[PDB]
């Protein structure tokens, strides 16, 4: 696997709690998971429709 | 929130305390007048008593 260090294939680094806040970081992590699921539905619909 | 449970069985302080030396000095300044007043009030804890309102000189 070429991405040895980037094991989770992330596009952006996790927010630093000391700068953005613990609550903000936790919300960001939840949003990231939902985006991955939403993108999956988004690719499938486009392929099926076009 | 905190709740106390019972008389302490352990304690920690940021220094060594010699209780025997501290009490030996304090035993030299004891007042018999203050002790007697405390003894009398121990026997009159209940306000709703006839014997708690007799005739006496002073506070107790």
């Amino acid at each position: 696997h070429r991405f040895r260090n980037n094991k989770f294939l992330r596009l952006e680094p996790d927010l630093d709690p000391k700068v953005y806040g613990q609550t903000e970081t936790l919300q960001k992590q939840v949003d990231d998971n939902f985006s991955l699921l939403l993108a999956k539905h988004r690719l499938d619909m486009k392929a099926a429709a076009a | 929130t905190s709740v106390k449970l019972f008389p302490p069985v352990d304690a920690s302080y940021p220094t060594y305390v010699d209780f025997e030396h501290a009490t030996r000095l304090l035993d030299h300044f004891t007042s018999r007048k203050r002790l007697n007043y405390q003894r009398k009030m121990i026997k009159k804890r209940d306000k709703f008593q006839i014997k708690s309102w007799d005739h006496h000189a002073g506070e107790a």
Binding site: - | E20, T23, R24, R39, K40, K43
Partner: protein
């Protein structure tokens, strides 16, 4: 300073230090340290404490000048059931104290105590022109005595007692000697018990005070005596 080395030294095993220290102490000559080898071995089984009792100065006059001589007494004893008194004389106070301290280890003796904290019964002793009285007290009550006797009680391990001394107490050597002799006049329940034919059993009985004490405090004695 190097904090890492400071931390390393603080949290270290002391077995190596103990072996080196013990070997050095036991290999010293009898002149610098006149303590017998047998006593040195026992010194590693307990924790010890010492205190100066008194220092006296004697003067002898001659044709031209005066000769000064010092005498001192030092008491040492392990925390529980060991006590000894030593006397030393020298041309200076510092030397007299050192000789007395060394002599104390040659005079160690056992002190009988009830449960290791008080005396068995009331004791009255008459050392020459001195009177000492010892009264047992309940565990945890504390010590009621003079400052000199308070130090002596710490060495022996006595925790609850009342001591009263009267008479010609100018010479503190006699006062300490009288206290030492009083402790040795106690009797124990197990002395010659085989010749009694009975079972000597410890019992629980609360001590009482005199009537005047009850009246002043406004309290009552045990019901066993008030029964009417």
């Amino acid at each position: 300073i190097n904090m890492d080395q400071y931390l390393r030294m603080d949290n270290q095993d002391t077995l190596e230090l103990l072996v080196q220290a013990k070997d050095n102490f036991l290999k010293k000559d009898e002149r610098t340290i006149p303590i017998p080898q047998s006593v040195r071995e026992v010194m590693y089984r307990h924790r010890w404490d010492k205190v100066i009792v008194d220092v006296r100065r004697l003067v002898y006059r001659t044709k031209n000048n005066k000769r000064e001589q010092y005498t001192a007494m030092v008491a040492s004893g392990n925390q529980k059931g060991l006590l000894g008194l030593g006397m030393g004389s020298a041309e200076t106070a510092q030397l007299a104290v050192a000789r007395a301290y060394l002599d104390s280890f040659s005079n160690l003796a056992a002190v009988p105590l009830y449960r290791g904290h008080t005396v068995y019964h009331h004791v009255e002793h008459h050392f020459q022109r001195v009177k000492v009285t010892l009264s047992p007290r309940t565990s945890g009550w504390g010590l009621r005595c003079s400052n000199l006797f308070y130090e002596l009680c710490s060495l022996a391990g006595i925790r609850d007692l009342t001591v009263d001394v009267s008479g010609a107490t100018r010479n503190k050597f006699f006062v300490a000697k009288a206290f030492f002799d009083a402790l040795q006049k106690q009797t124990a329940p197990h002395d010659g018990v085989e010749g009694t034919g009975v079972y000597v059993k410890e019992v629980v009985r609360r001590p009482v005070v005199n009537l005047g004490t009850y009246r002043n405090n406004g309290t009552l004695p045990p019901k066993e005596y008030l029964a009417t």
